Amino acid sequence: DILELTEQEELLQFHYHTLRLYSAVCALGNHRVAHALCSHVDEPQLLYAIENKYMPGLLRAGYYDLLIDIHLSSYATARLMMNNEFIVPMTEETKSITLFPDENKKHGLPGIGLSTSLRPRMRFSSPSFVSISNDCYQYSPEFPLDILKAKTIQMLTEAVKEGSLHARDPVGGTTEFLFVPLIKLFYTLLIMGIFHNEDLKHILQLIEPSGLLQMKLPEPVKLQMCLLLQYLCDCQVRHRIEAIVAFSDDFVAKLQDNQRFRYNEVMQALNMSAALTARKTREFRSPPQEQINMLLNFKDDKSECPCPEEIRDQLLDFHEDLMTHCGIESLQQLISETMVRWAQESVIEDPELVRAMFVLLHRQYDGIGGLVRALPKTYTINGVSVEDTINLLASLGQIRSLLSVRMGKEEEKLMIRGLGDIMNNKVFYQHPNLMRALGMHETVMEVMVNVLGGGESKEITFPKMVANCCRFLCYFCRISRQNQKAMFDHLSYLLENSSVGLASPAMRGSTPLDVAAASVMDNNELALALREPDLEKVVRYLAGCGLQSCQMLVSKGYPDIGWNPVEGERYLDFLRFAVFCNGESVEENANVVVRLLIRRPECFGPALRGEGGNGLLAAMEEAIKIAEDPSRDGPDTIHMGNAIMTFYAALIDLLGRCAPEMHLIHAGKGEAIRIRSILRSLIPLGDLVGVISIAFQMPEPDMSAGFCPDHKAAMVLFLDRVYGIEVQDFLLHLLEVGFLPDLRAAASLDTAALSX
Amino acid sequence: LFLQGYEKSWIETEEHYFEDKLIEDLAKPGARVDPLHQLILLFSRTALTEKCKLEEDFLYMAYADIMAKSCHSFEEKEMEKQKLLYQQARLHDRGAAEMVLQTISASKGETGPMVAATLKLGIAILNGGNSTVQQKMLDYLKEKKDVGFFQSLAGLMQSCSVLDLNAFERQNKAEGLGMVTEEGSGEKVLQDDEFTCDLFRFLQLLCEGHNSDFQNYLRTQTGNNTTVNIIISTVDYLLRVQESISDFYWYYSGKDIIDEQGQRNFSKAIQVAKQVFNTLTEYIQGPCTGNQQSLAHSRLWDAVVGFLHVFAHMQ
Amino acid sequence: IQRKAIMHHEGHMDDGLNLSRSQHEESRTARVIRSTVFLFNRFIRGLDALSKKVKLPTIDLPIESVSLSLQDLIGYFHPPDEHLEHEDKQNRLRALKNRQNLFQEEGMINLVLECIDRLHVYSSAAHFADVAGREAGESWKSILNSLYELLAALIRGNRKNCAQFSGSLDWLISRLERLEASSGILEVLHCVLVESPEALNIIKEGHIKSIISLLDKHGRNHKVLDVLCSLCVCHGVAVRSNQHLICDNLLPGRDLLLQTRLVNHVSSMRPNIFLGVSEGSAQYKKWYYELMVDHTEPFVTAEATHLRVGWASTEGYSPYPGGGEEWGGNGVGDDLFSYGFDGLHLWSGCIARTVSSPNQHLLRTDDVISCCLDLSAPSISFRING
Amino acid sequence: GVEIETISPGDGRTFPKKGQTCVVHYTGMLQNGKKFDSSRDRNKPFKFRIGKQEVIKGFEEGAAQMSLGQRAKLTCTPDVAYGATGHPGVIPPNATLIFDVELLNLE
């Protein structure tokens, strides 16, 4: 008999530890082992163990925790993760809680009413082993939730009845073993989306009546009590936010037609004056954010208030209702009373319990702080995209669970699948604000730093995971205007490990350096806020790649050139994206980049800068001959001549784009003249025209991984932005040497066109 | 967008007053140890638990703010001073001075919201010439000979905030053409002037009364292995802010027009410099020849020369 | 960077030798490290000279001194009391961490490992006695236990130590099967797996198989289960590979650990009838009776309805017939003192044997059974429906 | 490999046919009597198709030889139930299964 283990100390302890092992082997979202442990113990033996009054107590707690872990912990953790995200639809059920009963002498009970909020769908697969090749066995083992609900309700009633009389043998032994597992099961059940209004009323009928909070409970019991009350206030805050959105729908629906009517009235009774075009530019400009910002400010005597004063009274009524529903001037009062009483009864150990009690007391006394912390995270979407948003939330919860578990092959594959799902979810395109509210970039960055942790330059464990993460982050920053600013903070981090993923022309997209370039790309404000705590790091990386040999090509079989042109190209690409935005050169960024490049001369090519190679002419002719002779390559492959050529072209392009200007400011500023003189001393003009005059062959198709006209295009851009064409002699000269042969080669084309 | 605006400028506009009643009914011994004393002991144990970095601790950041906001024609002045002293007694007879000292020492000299809230609490606990709290702090620092508190103060004074002109020029260039955001958050030019003035006001309140013992302990920490000169750190920060003000004047020298961003940066600089000067006055007041010689044998004369120059030209 | 100092005549005006007082705690710790490394090198040299080949017994083998030194070092690294002041406990924790860091940064853990290897090269205490002597063979067990306790205490609280020596887990788990220091090896494994997440990345399938074989050999020990729990979850994160390996290699055959079932309560009824045989006065040795059933559900709640009928013996001429004790799943036929029949099988000794019969089935409703029994030559017999 | 032992006759009239979702109620157990699976525990039957390659052969080929309301003991072999690899975690390698197959409904 299992009850005989009360006296046997060995078997008691060993079975308690094997129950703890059953719990730990499937604690997190591991369902392939839960599907085994269910039958390995039983389906209804868990009920019998939580149901039996005669238990040693250790086995009782073990069986309770085992039931929680193998039947409820997965969905409990899913809801705990997606619990602070208040995603609301726009269906008519949302507009039904516009009353949020607070007036006429009633406040309501926490958890009673309508949810109408986006929550993860729960489902439990049926445990069956005669079914060979089950579909997924990924959700959870199935359990009779209703039977467990009735059983735990009646047992909680019996347990509080027994504890009210202070017996000498509580169930399982101590009052700890009596209460803690039972109230933990009840807490996770209330979490996992059961105890509808009917049963929740009966539950509150044993803690509310003014009970369970009046007994002399130990520390591990009152800790679970504090957690339960914290959830009871969390659902109340959720109801508050739902009511806020319900009222806001109709309020903004009225206000939109009100402002449209006033705009049409101005259109009709225009009556031309000087302030009319000012009102027109105010209506056209001032995007909806600052439009709402201006039309919502009336608390003092007089300020900027529009004509619709009638809706202001409704707004004041709703705000007053909100303030009287909040903690400012009975659940909050009773929770506060219980917390202060528990603190005054005796000195409390368990600093975790003390902290939980105090944060509960503080949030009950504050009330509004939950609102100002949760309103930045709430978001209403639609009544048509509900299933798409549900799929998005499910994939995000999968990503969060995979982040919680350790990284492996199957974990990496599942994370890649989840990233693909959230990229093709079709809501990522429409609502990026919701993406920032959920914090998808945050979790993806956490996954990326967990993958990158462990190795600096020796080996990057779990490859292609950082790649999928960087691609997702690139696309997230791409389809936006403020996600770039939100991600700019992580740029200072990812620039340190930006060296990974380079030296491999297989991922021109996903890379930390490329996601940095995408975050600063096409954003003047970010290009200006990009100060230099990291530009110096970038030029240091460029210097290192220009000095060393990257120790990656000698392993493949390359001739070990004394400098790396594949990482320098990417570094110069990032510097170009940071210095040249929207068609104009950022002045101070160009200045500091030039300063760093002239203080560290090893950033340029060895055959162009230094006491060795002559200049760009000889450098690029050497590059062409390296491209021509296959004896200096690696036996899709990296053509070393082409790499040197694109590196020099990217350096020339960066210098031309970091040129001061096309002389608008240079006609009056001296530092512009100094920077132009430095650029001219670096790159001469004869070198430029000689490099322009190469007369590339134009083919029977050929390969596009050689000398491409993009090099001479960058040369022309540098010549135009630094030297320019202003005198007839040099103009005709250049036109004769470089432009006529290229134009003739481009005109010699009838049908076979392979190089656009 | 309506909900975002409502969250932004409708709800957090000082719509509650509960700190005093909260501190009162937490300090009430309903019956041992009071709940407020238990909370202070919890914070002290958390600060004494040796780690590598001071955690965020939203609990502490939310409770230090409350305990600081709880605090604050002759009879009414005396009565309000006595009420302030009573509140300070209520919330420091349970060891809040030790809590502030431990939280400052457990930051290793790194600017953060925890340090900001702790300095606000120290200011609210040392408002006026409260000598009891100063004596408690001095006895604690002497009976626990630790240099971590002093090096954390030195690091904070060395890396709190200084005006820069490059960021202001970049902000000007941004607001010249970019109308997507208007750059409503005027930051990156003076990072946290609130924290800077809070730190220097905390030092001023530490040396508020003419405590020769504390004025000498802030100069030479006798009994400790290594000593750091808080006076020299303060005069160095004064020189730095003087150079920053001089550069900002050189920038705004010639156009004879000061925009609202310029005026706000001027006002923040003036407030920070005034707080630094008040701290120096509280350091040197009384016949404290130690601090007097320390200020006379430093770069204070160059700082005051530059200050006189900028004063004349700006006025 | 190694700027070797050289004493030259002229000197340069840039030395600036500033002093640091080298806190008494650190000084005492360093001198203790020196004394312990000296004594341990002495013991290692002695044991190496003894093991490599037979040598003169005129060697330095301080068995008693090294035992006392281990007993002192264990108390030196003893953790502080949990029922103490918070501030003093934190100070003692910091001092213990400093001592552990100083012992690690001077090459002491590898020294202990070398001593442990040179002690484990011998098989048993009797095997060590004839080689080292009576006292050394007597206290070799104590020395090994103290060395393993010291190795565990050096790494109990610290994390850098575990993350540094984690490469010795292969040797640890290989020596785990010495049958003699299993407790110490398991404790070291537990304290190195509970703190360092680097250790879980090098625990392969072979190590888990070896730990499970240890559980299968040494018996039921909860320390093995705690080590398995630490392997499954280290710090708030799960290892799916380790969890799957545990689930596959720990409970495939259900013999490694206890099993459990939910069985029914069965009851044994009888009339006041006793049938015994002896020489002289007998009872004709032939009896018979019948059976009908009114209502019988096949499965009342969850399992098959236990229903058997037959004849049970006793302990000679006494009451209290066969059965284990009471109230278990033991009806009739579940032991050697009982013989039962359930409709389809025959039960004798908790071993059911199948039989053939026209329309064979369980004791369903409207089933007339007839039980006959002859005592001397034949045995009991059953007739279903005639 | 698959066999059947009649436990309670089910009138021997209606038999499962190809292309039906049959309703079964089973409790399994290993060779040594250790229970490993059942359907009376979760209080719900098991609905499975015949000839759709979803249930193990030792179960489907044995259920195809039963009648409505019939109880049987189905004994399997490793090569017909799980093979030399068994079920990871539950069934050991080369384990013979025993089922109390009771036929509830035919659809």
**HEC assignment per residue over A299-341:** CCCCCCCCCCCHHHHHHHHHHHHHHHHCCCCCHHHHHHHHHHH
CB contact under 8 A, A24 and C251: no
Least Cα distance to B212 among B119, B299, B292 occurs for B292
CB contact under 8 A, B38 and A292: no
| Pairing mode of beta strands A379-380, A87-88 | parallel
DSSP A379: E
Q: Find out whether C346 and C353 touch, Cβ atoms under 8 Å.
A: yes
Separation in Å, CA D2 to CA A180, A486, C361, D76? 49, 64, 21, 5
Least Cα distance to A754 among A695, A702, A696, A697 occurs for A702
| Pairing mode of beta strands C352-354, D98-105 | unpaired
Structure tokens at B215: 């004025």
- The amino acid occupying position C271 is P
* Residue listed under structure tokens 């190496």: C48
CB contact under 8 A, A132 and D54: yes
> From the CA of A242, how many Å to the nearest CA of chain C?
33
Residue A7 C-beta-side C-alpha neighbours within 13 Å? 2
CB-based burial label for D8 (10 Å; 0-12, 13-18, 19+): middle
CB contact under 8 A, C302 and D40: yes
Q: Do chains D and B touch (3 or more CB pairs under 8 A)?
A: no
> From the CA of A14, how many Å to the nearest CA of chain C?
6
DSSP A402: H
The radius of gyration of chain D's CA atoms, rounded to the nearest angstrom, is: 13
DSSP sequence for chain D:
----EEEE--TT-----SS-EEEEE-EEE-TTS---EESTTTT--EEEETTSS-B-HHHHHHHTT--TT-EEEEE--HHHHTTTS--TTTSPSS---EEEEEEEE--
**Any chain A CB within 8 A of the CB of D99?**
yes
Measured in whole angstroms, the distance separating CA C12 from the mean position of its chain's CA atoms is 66
d(CA B229, CA D12): 102
Determine how many CB atoms are found less than 10 A away from the CB of residue A130: 23
d(CA A511, CA C126): 65
Structure tokens at C121: 């090269």
Do you know the residue count of chain C? 386
Determine how many CB atoms are found less than 10 A away from the CB of residue C60: 11
Which residue among the candidates D26, D59, D91, D98 is catalytic per the annotation? Answer: D26
d(CA D36, CA A41): 9
d(CA A99, CA B235): 61
Least Cα distance to B150 among B75, B262, B229, B248 occurs for B229
Angle of the A710-718 helix axis to the A640-657 helix axis, nearest 10? 30
Which chain A residues contact residue D59 at CB under 8 A? 130
Least Cα distance to A356 among B40, B58, C85, B64 occurs for B58
**Any chain A CB within 8 A of the CB of C121?**
no
Structure tokens at A521: 């790309």
Q: Find out whether A466 and A448 touch, Cβ atoms under 8 Å.
A: yes
d(CA B18, CA C49): 79
Structure tokens at B247: 């550069």
- The amino acid occupying position B270 is I
Could you tell me which residues are beta bridge partners of residue D98?
D29, D75
- The amino acid occupying position B247 is D
Q: What is the 3-state secondary structure (H, E, C) of A581-619?
A: ECCEECHHHHHHHHHHHHHCHHHCCCCCCCCCCCCHHHH
Least Cα distance to A297 among A288, A285, A305, A287 occurs for A305
d(CA B61, CA B112): 11
Question: How many CB pairs below 8 Å do chains A and C form together?
Answer: 84
Q: Find out whether C382 and C369 touch, Cβ atoms under 8 Å.
A: yes
CB contact under 8 A, C303 and D40: yes
d(CA A513, CA A470): 9
Which chain B residues contact residue C87 at CB under 8 A? 48
Which chain C residues contact residue D91 at CB under 8 A? 252
CB-based burial label for B120 (10 Å; 0-12, 13-18, 19+): buried
Q: What is the 3-state secondary structure (H, E, C) of chain C?
A: CCCCCCCCCCCCCCCCCCCCCCCHHHHHHHHHHHHHHHHHHHHHHHHHHHHHCCCCCCCCCCHHHHHHHHHHHHHHCCCCCCCCCHHHHHHHHHHHHHHHHHHHCCCCHHHHHHHHHHHHCCCCHHHHHHHHCHHHHHHHHHHHHHHHHHHHHCCCCCCHHHHHHHHHHHHHHHHCCCCCCHHHHHHHHHHHHCCCCCHHHCCCHHHHHHHHHHHHHHCCCHHHHHHHHHHHECCCCECHHHHHHHHHHCCCCCCCCCCCCCCCCCCCCCCCCCCCCCCCCCCCCEEEEEECCCCCCCCCCCCCCCCCEEEECCCCCCCCCCCCCCCCCCCCCCCCCEEEECCCEEECCCCEEECCCCCCCCCCCCCCEEEEEECCCCCEEEEECC
Q: Find out whether A498 and A541 touch, Cβ atoms under 8 Å.
A: yes
d(CA A549, CA A540): 15
B196 Cβ neighbours under 8 A, 6+ residues apart: B160, B161, B272, B275
Q: Is A88 helix (H, G, I), strand (E, B) or coil?
A: strand
| Pairing mode of beta strands C338-341, A379-380 | unpaired
Which chain C residues contact residue A28 at CB under 8 A? 233, 237-238
Least Cα distance to A247 among B3, C217, D88 occurs for B3
> From the CA of A228, how many Å to the nearest CA of chain D?
29
d(CA B238, CA A105): 61
D82 catalytically annotated: yes
Separation in Å, CA B148 to CA A604, B102, B108, C335? 46, 9, 7, 77
Q: Find out whether B127 and B72 touch, Cβ atoms under 8 Å.
A: yes
Q: Classify the phi-psi angles of A106: left when phi > 0, otherwise alpha if psi is within -120 to 50, otherwise beta.
A: beta
* Residue listed under structure tokens 């105890």: A195
d(CA A579, CA A653): 11
Structure tokens at A608: 């162009």
**Any chain B CB within 8 A of the CB of A492?**
no
d(CA B153, CA B219): 13
Structure tokens at C293: 């059933």
Nearest CB partner across the interface for A525, out of B4, B166, B174: B174
CB contact under 8 A, B15 and A328: yes
Q: Find out whether C7 and C21 touch, Cβ atoms under 8 Å.
A: no
Q: Find out whether D45 and D23 touch, Cβ atoms under 8 Å.
A: yes
Q: What are phi and psi of B89, to 5 degrees?
A: -65, -45
CB contact under 8 A, D55 and A39: no
| Substitution target from D43, D90, D102 for chain A, most A beta carbons within 10 A | D90
d(CA D41, CA A48): 12
Do you know the residue count of chain D? 107
Question: How many CB pairs below 8 Å do chains A and D form together?
Answer: 50
d(CA A357, CA A343): 9
Nearest CB partner across the interface for D35, out of C248, C261, C299: C261
Q: What are phi and psi of C152, to 5 degrees?
A: -70, -40
DSSP A737: I
End-to-end CA distance of chain B: 45
Helix (H) or strand (E) holding B116: helix B113-125
- Chain C residue at shortest CA distance from A25: C243
Q: Find out whether D39 and D45 touch, Cβ atoms under 8 Å.
A: yes
Q: Is A107 helix (H, G, I), strand (E, B) or coil?
A: coil
Least Cα distance to D69 among D38, D23, D21, D2 occurs for D23
d(CA A720, CA A727): 13
Structure tokens at A440: 């998808």
Structure tokens at A625: 């001959």
- Chain D residue at shortest CA distance from A135: D54
| Pairing mode of beta strands C338-341, C309-312 | antiparallel
Structure tokens at A81: 């993760």
d(CA C115, CA D27): 57
Question: Touching A: which chains, 3+ CB pairs < 8 A?
Answer: B, C, D
Structure tokens at B128: 């006026």
- The amino acid occupying position A135 is D
Helices (H) and strands (E) in chain B, counts: 16, 0
Determine how many CB atoms are found less than 10 A away from the CB of residue A45: 19
Residue A143 C-beta-side C-alpha neighbours within 13 Å? 28
* Residue listed under structure tokens 């650029």: A679
End-to-end CA distance of chain C: 103
Structure tokens at A247: 């009222």
Helix (H) or strand (E) holding A380: strand A379-380
Which chain A residues contact residue B46 at CB under 8 A? 351
Give just the sign of the alpha carbon dihedral A401, A403, A407, A408. positive
D36 catalytically annotated: yes
CB contact under 8 A, A128 and D37: yes
Residue A622 C-beta-side C-alpha neighbours within 13 Å? 14
CB contact under 8 A, D37 and A36: no
CB contact under 8 A, A528 and B173: yes
Structure tokens at D14: 């209606």
- The amino acid occupying position A228 is L
Which residue among the candidates D36, D46, D48, D100 is catalytic per the annotation? Answer: D36
Q: Find out whether A311 and A258 touch, Cβ atoms under 8 Å.
A: yes
Give just the sign of the alpha carbon dihedral B234, B238, B243, B244. positive
Angle of the A175-191 helix axis to the A219-268 helix axis, nearest 10? 20
CB contact under 8 A, D56 and A142: no
CB contact under 8 A, A408 and C241: yes
d(CA C11, CA C3): 15
- Chain C residue at shortest CA distance from A1: C328
Q: Find out whether A654 and A661 touch, Cβ atoms under 8 Å.
A: no
Which residue among the candidates D4, D59, D91, D99 is catalytic per the annotation? Answer: D99
**Any chain A CB within 8 A of the CB of B24?**
no
CB contact under 8 A, C94 and B225: no
CB-based burial label for B91 (10 Å; 0-12, 13-18, 19+): buried
**Any chain B CB within 8 A of the CB of A245?**
yes
D99 catalytically annotated: yes
CB-based burial label for A332 (10 Å; 0-12, 13-18, 19+): buried
Q: What are phi and psi of C356, to 5 degrees?
A: -110, 140
Q: What are phi and psi of D97, to 5 degrees?
A: -100, 155
Nearest CB partner across the interface for B7, out of A285, A367, A375: A375
d(CA A479, CA A474): 9
Q: Classify the phi-psi angles of A663: left when phi > 0, otherwise alpha if psi is within -120 to 50, otherwise beta.
A: left
| Substitution target from A3, A12, A17, A66 for chain C, most C beta carbons within 10 A | A17
Structure tokens at C166: 């984690």
> From the CA of B159, how many Å to the nearest CA of chain C?
27
Q: Is A453 helix (H, G, I), strand (E, B) or coil?
A: coil
* Residue listed under structure tokens 């798409």: A388
d(CA A463, CA A627): 31
Least Cα distance to B107 among B49, B42, B160, B152 occurs for B152
Least Cα distance to A500 among A567, A586, A438 occurs for A567
> From the CA of C176, how many Å to the nearest CA of chain A?
21
Which chain B residues contact residue C21 at CB under 8 A? 225
> From the CA of A688, how many Å to the nearest CA of chain B?
33
The radius of gyration of chain A's CA atoms, rounded to the nearest angstrom, is: 35
| Substitution target from A129, A133, A143 for chain D, most D beta carbons within 10 A | A129
> From the CA of C72, how many Å to the nearest CA of chain A?
33
D37 catalytically annotated: yes
C195 Cβ neighbours under 8 A, 6+ residues apart: C155, C157, C158, C159, C162
d(CA B9, CA C243): 51
d(CA A354, CA A343): 8
